[PDB]
């Protein structure tokens, strides 16, 4: 409703770096809000794509940003009559970024790993890895829970059980208020998908450079499965947290699985022990139901509600014809211990191939009416196909069925405007929560400031 579309701010990064693939706000020890941006195709030392991270200070005129430096050198350790290897080439550092406290967590989902023992090997596979940083202090740490030293032969003898070689840890990420990092690994357990959690404080204290394989005893990974419904489901394509069990001492996890049950798609709510409390099945096959998940209380009853995006949903139209436009599902949490029923609201896109629902960002309370609001991206929507971000306002009955404001893309075609969103933070300190929108196709980020309501 009250996002300023006239006077935007623009940050930018190197060409072909996909600057803006992922972003998030970041407050320092003194509360100064900045913007962390991930550029997963930034050039490294060998003039090769490795990714990179930038920490943009707040400036109404935007501009260039300084780099948040991480080690980009490949590592090798000969230990235990074995040889450990890390390959950061095309790792995609910055394909996801998230902030918690004064710490930044940037991840390289496609960092490769291999172990050599004589003529055998573990296979060169993308286990993924995340890089943690405390900018003010300069502290650094890593976290790669899917690295292993098991040889290829062993996996064959065991029928490829608990195979964490293709995890891609960091594909998605989130951190609880308590400080528990939770990584999505949609390739873990032979493309079933796993989760991996660990306290940030324990990641830092248990990490040392050059070890490559170290233990984080406080960590906790999810479990393999024999059920074909989970085969090739990419469990962990998207991840979020919230409260869905009444008990406040516990934190519940939300996991997206856009290809669960033969490309039907599903989202599952779990406890911190990965025990499923509920499951939300897709409505249409290959709609990628679960591509994005958002958690926010939209009706102001204090109970977190759930939002799921199916960007490839094909709406039914006249003459028995389907039209890929996308869709978003709203699930309002019921009072006390009860199951999330059918969706309370169905928001469907309009632009063909627009991919409505590819991203869903909680905005907080934008118009300051008491109800929290959201933004839904259609990175290829709008009459031009350049992109669009639609704002939907909260009400006692859930969400408004029509958007209050539509942000058209200020970038050229193919910018993927809206592929990454983030809101519910007041960066200019005007008392209103603002919205940052990424456009990796144009290597830029657009900041929309919220202003007092005109009406």
């Amino acid at each position, epitope marked *: 409703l009250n996002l300023d579309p006239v006077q935007l701010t623009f940050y930018a990064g190197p060409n072909g770096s996909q600057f803006g693939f992922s972003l998030d706000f970041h407050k320092d020890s003194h509360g100064r809000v900045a913007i962390v941006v991930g550029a997963p195709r930034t050039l490294g030392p060998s003039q090769e794509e490795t990714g990179g991270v930038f920490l943009c200070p707040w400036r109404a005129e935007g501009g260039q940003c300084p780099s948040l430096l991480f080690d980009l050198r490949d590592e090798t350790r000969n*230990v*235990g009559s074995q040889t450990l290897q890390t390959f950061k080439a095309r790792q995609g550092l910055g394909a996801s970024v998230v902030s918690w406290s004064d710490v930044i967590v940037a991840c390289a989902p496609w960092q490769h790993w291999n172990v050599l023992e004589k003529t055998e090997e573990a296979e060169k596979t993308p286990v993924g890895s995340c890089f943690l940083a405390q900018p003010e202090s300069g502290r650094r740490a890593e976290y790669s829970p899917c690295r292993g030293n098991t040889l290829s032969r062993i996996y064959v003898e065991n029928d490829f059980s608990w195979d964490k070689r293709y995890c891609e840890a960091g594909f998605s990420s989130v951190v609880t208020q308590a400080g528990e990092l939770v990584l999505g690994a949609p390739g873990g357990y032979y493309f079933l998908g796993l989760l991996a959690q660990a306290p940030v404080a324990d990641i830092f204290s248990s990490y040392r450079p050059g*070890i490559l394989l170290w233990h984080v*005893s406080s960590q906790s990974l999810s479990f393999d499965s024999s059920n074909p419904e989970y085969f090739d489901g990419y469990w962990g394509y998207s991840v979020a947290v919230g409260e869905f069990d009444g008990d406040l001492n516990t934190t519940e996890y939300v996991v997206g699985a856009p290809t669960w049950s033969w490309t039907l798609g599903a989202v599952e709510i779990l406890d911190s022990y990965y025990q499923r409390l509920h499951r939300l099945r897709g409505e249409q096959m290959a709609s990628y139901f679960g591509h994005s998940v958002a958690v926010t209380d939209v009706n102001g009853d204090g109970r977190h509600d759930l939002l799921v995006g199916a960007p490839l949903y094909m709406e039914s139209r006249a003459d028995r014809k389907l039209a890929e436009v996308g869709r978003v599902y709203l699930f309002l949490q019921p009072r006390g211990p009860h199951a999330l029923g059918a969706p309370s609201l169905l928001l469907t896109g309009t632009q063909l191939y627009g991919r409505f629902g590819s991203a869903i960002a909680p905005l907080g309370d934008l118009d300051r009416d008491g109800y929290n609001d959201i933004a839904v991206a259609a990175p290829y929507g709008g009459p031009s196909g350049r992109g669009q971000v639609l704002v939907f306002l909260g009400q006692s009955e859930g969400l408004r069925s029509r958007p209050s404001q539509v942000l058209d893309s200020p970038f050229p075609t193919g910018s993927a405007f809206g592929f990454s969103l983030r809101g519910a933070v007041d960066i200019d300190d005007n008392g209103y929560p603002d919205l940052i929108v990424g456009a990796y196709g144009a290597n830029q980020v657009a900041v929309y400031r919220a202003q007092p309501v005109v009406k």
Partner: antibody
Amino acid sequence: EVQLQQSGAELVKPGASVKLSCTASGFNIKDTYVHWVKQRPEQGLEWIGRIDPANGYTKYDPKFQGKATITADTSSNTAYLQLSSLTSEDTAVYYCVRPLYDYYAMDYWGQGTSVTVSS
Amino acid sequence: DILMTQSPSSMSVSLGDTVSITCHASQGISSNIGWLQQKPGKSFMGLIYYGTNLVDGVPSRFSGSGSGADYSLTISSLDSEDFADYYCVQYAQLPYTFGGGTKLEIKR
């Protein structure tokens, strides 16, 4: 806190077999490797072998192949070391070891189990 | 098998001194070394892992160093409890091999 409670001292006769144990306290034995080390006053410290209690695979120093046999039970959260065809040279204190962070380290040690072989 | 030549076998020193134990390998191990402490009539306690990293709970006066095939454990300002046995162990190759040992004896 991590602690490794090993079994009490053993006293057996030559030619017999003994099975030491290493129970884990404060954590899961399945977390890391579990090594076994032999200590004698004159010969000093010697590495027997290791086991991965998660899958059961083991590695041994060729000096102990046949004599030593390491096993583990995740249920009881305990790791075991069996020594067959005992002799006088098998008279030594045996420790179970695990790393702290580094997968291949030797940081935490049990109290040790004394073994005496004599008729 | 990698041989670990630890020296000296023993040394007589006093409190507050700064001593340095060494450990030589038969080949390079690239900091894949740990340092252990065995107080008399007791079990072992980890001090260092991977050449220089201290084990949690170990005083900061302890410190490891070195590279290649020569490493050194150093204790700044000895304490009454620091008089004990000390061993180096390599895990660069299986089987793990230990050093001879070093006994810190009180001087008088």
